[PDB]
Structures are given as structure tokens and as C-alpha cells.
């Protein structure tokens, strides 16, 4: 009655035939060699990420999908900066699970493939689709570990993937549903389900005004949708006074550009302009689910960016919480405006680290596309921790420069202390990062521009087309390692 | 001239129709007591049937004003005045016929007509020139919204022309 996904490796030069995983070889034994026999008859060997489906092998598993895992011993690939074996497993298991789903089978058991966490990630990421609003849906598939030996690692993969899928849900949902208020309520319920050691404050416009967040308010005011400032606390440290790590996420729930209005083409993707808030909030939910013994604060200014008779006008000058004035030359450079105020507020926590994420610039997509999230940081220690985490998760990061060269192009400003768009078109992600740095005094800060990793087409084999929720798992892995130190 | 430069350079969220009128008022009054200033509100603009001006202002939530300034410098109070008129668009987004993003910030200076004529009148008063002068500056923003001018709309000017 269930489907079964089993792995096979590529044949090594010294082997007579490609080797099954332990689970594949055991299943083959159970069916008196019929799996190997039919795989032989079926023709060419299964290469990494490829699948083949065999029917009627066992009364309990009418459909068995064998998936190619590539080289058994594939480890860290220094030319790709990731663990290749884990990436092979995520892709192959995703492909196998999609095939089971296409056969309309509601239950699947999955070979741990020598790394149950990566297997669970492939299945759970691989099956995910946002289809709440559609009458016609694929069968809902319940994936479970095949066997009972690798359970903690399997559940850890489920938890990591579910954190990323939460971010994908939050990003994909249409903006008329995923308003600042709705986003805050969904993160609140998820965080509270994860741990009772949690406080959530959905701070209203009146509080934003009391906090003198003039830069954030200037963005929100064009729209009739109320802004909120989401503040989430996870109190995981055994010492309540232990300084927290602080995450900050850009939560623009829809970006029209405002008065500096965007072109029509593909503007619908701007419902995911709260991806920064989605990924940092989701990572914190997952950290709470993991019980990590650390204090964490999440901060997400949430609003829409819309044109109207009260919107930001090019040339307007606004005052950030820290008292710096900003000339708003381009109203579509709104993420740095809202982040200025959130980053300022971040310092009030005495944090150990400040990490922000934002779908910030088109220039980042032109620079590195969906190959890797761009990381700008004043701490090589912090860069290296994020980079090492990314190797394990496969959700890659790539360092980008914080140089005074770019700063000079944003503090050169006709009316104010800093200009919100550079003097030139060049290096847009770098001048955006330099603008943020004018609101940071902390010695361990990282800015992640995730505009290029906002969506997947087919680049990441285990994510279906749509909002990607990257790099949620790299953030979770970073927090997990930090908590062990 | 520097007064006009200040008025033009200031960001439009500070230099609103109301703020512009208040700054010109204080400068003119500091220049001479022989001065009247009327910061005419929307109700007066409507009473004056200025439908063409109102049609521009309505897209924005920023209140329009019609600034009227008198400098009574002639020894004869009945001497006909010279009249100056200045365009006071405090910010021009283009409205529904919206401008491109590039350098749109310079449109904070779309009240430069009002700035230069008002400033010249302030300076004339500072100079004690023996002439009667009236300055007129319709001031509003030009913004897109759910109540803005729509291409093809027909409006009626004060003189009755459509």
C-alpha cells in the first residue's frame, strides 16, 4: 500500500555492479533478488539524481522507485564549496518522492541513503508545494523513514526542511493574504508551537512612531495596509541574561516600487519581498524546535511599498531612529530604509552578533543569480561560520565586499547624511550594503542579500518551481553550531 | 536668489504648499510692513471656481493653497500693481502620466516659478521700491492615487474655458 524509495550508487571501477544502499540490498534480499534482476533487465545504470520505477515487487510496496545516489564516497567538493554526497541524496530522494506522488500514492517510505538527515531534506523539500488556493491539487504524500535506525537524523532533516518550507509558504502566499499583520500572526503561532520559552510582540504603528522609526514609517505610509514591527524572543540560554544573537529581516509584504514604480513584467514576484523576514523568522522557529541553548531575538519591520497621494516622494528627507537623515532619491530602494531603523533597534539588545537578510537588490541577482546568497560582513569569523554551515546544508553563501569605496558613493548626498541610492549604477548590492553599514556600529554584523535566491526554477533540484525560502537551513545550521561552539 | 534656492532645494516633505506659503509670508513681512499675505485655503480656491488648479491638487493628500502676496510700495494706493505669477508644484511625480524614476527627486524644485517670483517680491520690498506688486502662487503636489486627474478628463478653468 505504500511507495518505497531506495538508493543505488554509481558503479566504482573495482565493483562488478553498482551497489545498493543497505536498505536497497536488504529489500532485494526480501524479494529473492527480483529487484536486482529487474534493474538489470531495465537497461542502463542509474546515474546521480535519475530514477526508475518497478511495479509489483512486493505486496506491501506495489511501486518501488530506485534513485541514483552518485558516488558513495562523495564528500566535500572543494570546487563547489558543498558536501556533494548530501546534495546527491537530497536531489535523488526528491526525484523519487515526486515519482511516487505522480502515481497518486499517499504514503512513502524513504531509504536513509547513509545520511538520513539529507534524505529527509530531499523528501520534505522535494514534495512541498503551496497549493492552498487551488481546487486541483496533487495527492498529499506522507513521507517516513524506511527502517527504525536513523530516527534522530531523519527527524532533524524533517525539522530543517520544515523550517525552510515555512519560509517558502510565507514567501509564496499572495500579498493580499500575507499582510504585515497576517505574517506576524503566522510566525507567532509557529514560534509559540515550537517553545514556551518565547515572547512575541506585534508592535503597531503607535509603537513604531514612539520609537522614532521615521525611515521605516516613510515607506509604510504610501499604503493603506497597517505596518507592524515584529519582535520575537526565544529564551533558550540557561542564563537569562546571556546576550542574544539578533536577526533582522526586511518584511516588505509587497514592493510596487512606490512612486519610483516598477515595470509590470513579473512584478507579482514582489510578494516575496518579505523573504528576509521569512527566512530569519523561520530559522528562529526551527532553532526553538531544536531547543538550542541560546538566546535569540528576531526583528522584522513589515509594511507594503505602494504609490498613492501620501507615499514617499523622490528627494524627500527622512530621519532614522539614530538621528541620521536619509535622502530618498529612489522610493524602490525601500528595503534599506526600513532596515536602517531595525538595525538601529537591534543594537539596543547588546547582541553577540547581528545578522540581517533582505531581498534587497536587483544587482545581487545580476551578480550571482541563484548560485549563492551574497554575504557582506565586517567579521571574517562570522563569514567563516556562515560559509562552513553552508557547506553542510548545500544552500551556499558567497562573500561580497564592504569597502569604504562604496560608502563614499552613498554619503555623497545633496540634502542629507546618506543617499538611499548610489551616485552610479555600478555595484548596486555593494552600495546598498554600504548604506546599511552606516546604521551599524556592532563588530560582528552580516548582511545577506537574498534577492538572487528568492526563487527556484530548476537550479536546486529538490525545490519545485516557486519561492525558495533560501537560505533558511544555512541560518539554522549556523545557530546550531554556534550553540555548541 | 538664495531664498529661492533654499525654497527650491528643500525636500518636498518639508517644503509643502503650507510651509512654502509660511516661509514666504515671514520673509515678506520681515522686509516691509506695507505687505498683506493671504494663504488661501482649498475652500477659497473652490469659491474662486479654480477647477483646473483643483484638478491637479486632488490626487495628493497634501492640502493645496493659493498664495496671494501684496507689497504696497507706491505712494498712491490706487496705482495699478505689477502682477507676478509662479507655478508652485511642490513635488511633480507626473501623476497618472507618471514620470520615470531617474532623477525624479529634482521635481521637488517644481515650485521654482513660485520661489523666484516670491523671492523677487521680498527683495523688492527690502529695496523699498516705490511700486505696487502682487504675487500669486498656486501651490499643490502632483501625485497618482485613486482620486487623481485621469488622462482625457475635462476640467473647467476660472474663465469658463474647458
Amino acid at each position: 500500500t505504500k511507495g518505497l524509495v531506495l538508493g543505488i550508487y554509481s558503479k566504482e571501477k573495482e565493483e562488478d555492479e553498482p551497489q545498493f544502499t543497505s536498505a536497497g540490498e536488504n529489500f532485494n534480499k526480501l524479494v529473492s533478488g527480483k529487484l536486482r534482476e529487474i534493474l538489470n533487465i531495465s537497461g542502463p545504470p542509474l546515474k546521480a539524481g535519475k530514477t526508475r520505477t518497478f511495479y509489483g515487487l512486493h505486496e506491501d510496496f506495489p511501486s518501488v522507485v530506485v534513485v541514483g545516489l552518485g558516488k558513495k564516497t562523495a564528500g566535500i567538493d572543494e570546487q563547489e564549496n558543498w558536501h556533494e554526497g548530501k546534495e546527491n541524496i537530497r536531489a535523488a530522494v526528491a526525484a523519487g518522492c515526486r515519482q511516487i506522488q505522480d502515481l497518486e500514492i499517499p504514503s512513502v517510505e524513504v531509504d536513509p541513503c547513509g545520511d538520513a538527515q539529507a534524505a529527509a531534506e530531499g523528501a520534505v523539500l522535494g514534495l512541498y508545494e503551496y497549493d492552498d488556493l487551488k481546487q486541483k491539487r496533487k495527492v498529499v504524500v506522507s513521507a517516513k523513514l524506511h527502517g527504525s535506525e536513523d530516527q534522530e537524523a531523519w527527524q532533524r532533516g524533517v525539522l530543517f526542511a520544515s523550517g525552510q518550507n515555512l519560509a517558502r509558504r510565507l514567501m509564496e502566499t499572495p500579498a493580499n493574504e500575507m499582510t504585515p499583520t497576517k505574517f506576524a500572526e503566522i510566525v507567532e503561532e509557529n514560534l509559540k508551537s515550537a517553545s514556551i520559552k518565547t515572547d512575541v510582540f506585534i508592535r503597531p504603528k503607535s509603537w513604531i512612531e514612539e520609537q522614532e522609526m521615521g525611515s521605516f514609517l516613510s515607506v509604510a505610509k504610501g499604503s493603506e495596509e497597517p505596518p507592524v514591527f515584529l519582535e520575537i524572543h526565544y529564551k533558550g540560554s540557561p542564563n537569562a541574561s546571556e546576550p542574544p544573537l539578533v536577526f533582522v529581516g526586511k518584511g516588505i509584504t509587497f514592493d510596487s516600487g512606490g512612486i519610483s514604480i516598477k515595470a509590470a513584467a513579473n512584478m507579482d514576484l514582489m510578494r516575496a519581498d518579505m523573504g528576509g523576514a521569512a527566512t530569519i523568522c523561520s530559522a528562529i522557529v526551527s532553532a526553538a524546535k531544536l531547543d538550542l541553548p541560546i538566546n535569540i531575538v528576531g526583528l522584522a519591520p513589515l509594511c507594503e511599498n505602494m504609490p498613492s497621494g501620501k507615499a514617499n516622494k523622490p528627494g524627500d528627507v527622512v530621519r532614522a531612529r539614530n538621528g541620521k537623515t536619509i535622502q530618498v532619491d529612489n522610493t524602490d530602494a525601500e528595503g534599506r530604509l526600513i532596515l536602517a531603523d531595525a538595525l538601529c533597534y537591534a543594537h539596543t539588545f547588546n547582541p553577540k552578533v547581528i545578522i540581517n537578510a533582505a531581498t534587497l537588490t536587483g544587482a545581487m541577482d545580476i551578480a550571482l543569480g541563484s548560485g549563492a546568497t551574497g554575504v557582506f560582513t565586517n567579521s571574517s569569523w562570522l563569514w567563516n561560520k556562515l560559509f562552513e554551515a553552508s557547506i553542510e546544508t548545500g544552500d551556499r553563501v558567497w562573500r561580497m565586499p564592504l569597502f569604504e569605496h562604496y560608502t563614499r558613493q552613498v554619503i555623497d548626498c545633496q540634502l542629507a547624511d546618506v543617499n538611499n541610492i548610489g551616485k552610479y549604477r555600478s555595484a548596486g548590492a555593494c552600495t546598498a550594503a554600504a548604506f546599511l553599514k552606516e546604521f551599524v556600529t556592532h563588530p560582528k554584523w552580516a548582511h545577506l542579500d537574498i534577492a538572487g535566491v528568492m526563487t527556484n526554477k530548476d537550479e536546486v533540484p529538490y525545490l519545485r518551481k516557486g519561492m525558495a525560502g533560501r537560505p533558511t537551513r544555512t541560518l539554522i545550521e549556523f545557530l546550531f553550531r554556534f550553540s555548541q561552539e | 536668489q538664495n531664498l529661492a534656492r533654499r525654497l527650491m532645494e528643500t525636500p518636498a516633505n518639508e517644503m509643502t504648499p503650507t510651509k512654502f506659503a509660511e516661509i514666504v509670508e515671514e520673509n515678506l513681512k520681515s522686509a516691509s510692513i506695507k505687505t498683506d499675505v493671504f494663504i488661501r485655503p482649498k475652500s477659497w480656491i473652490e469659491e474662486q471656481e479654480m477647477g483646473s488648479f483643483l484638478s491637479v491638487a486632488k490626487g495628493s493628500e497634501e492640502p493645496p493653497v493659493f498664495l496671494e502676496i501684496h507689497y504696497k510700495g507706491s505712494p498712491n494706493a490706487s496705482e495699478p500693481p505689477l502682477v507676478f505669477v509662479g507655478k508652485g508644484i511642490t513635488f511633480d511625480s507626473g501623476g497618472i502620466s507618471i514620470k520615470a524614476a531617474a532623477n525624479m527627486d529634482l521635481m521637488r524644485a517644481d515650485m521654482g516659478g513660485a520661489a523666484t517670483i516670491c523671492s523677487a517680491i521680498v527683495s523688492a520690498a527690502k529695496l523699498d521700491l516705490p511700486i505696487n506688486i502682487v504675487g500669486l502662487a498656486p501651490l499643490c503636489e502632483n501625485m497618482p492615487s485613486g482620486k487623481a486627474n485621469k488622462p482625457g478628463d475635462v476640467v473647467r478653468a476660472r474663465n469658463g474655458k474647458t
Binding site: G362, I421, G428 | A101
Partner: peptide, 4 residues
């Protein structure tokens, strides 16, 4: 932000 767009470029440009």
C-alpha cells in the same frame, strides 16, 4: 533597488 533597481540598476537603474
Amino acid at each position: 533597488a533597481l540598476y537603474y
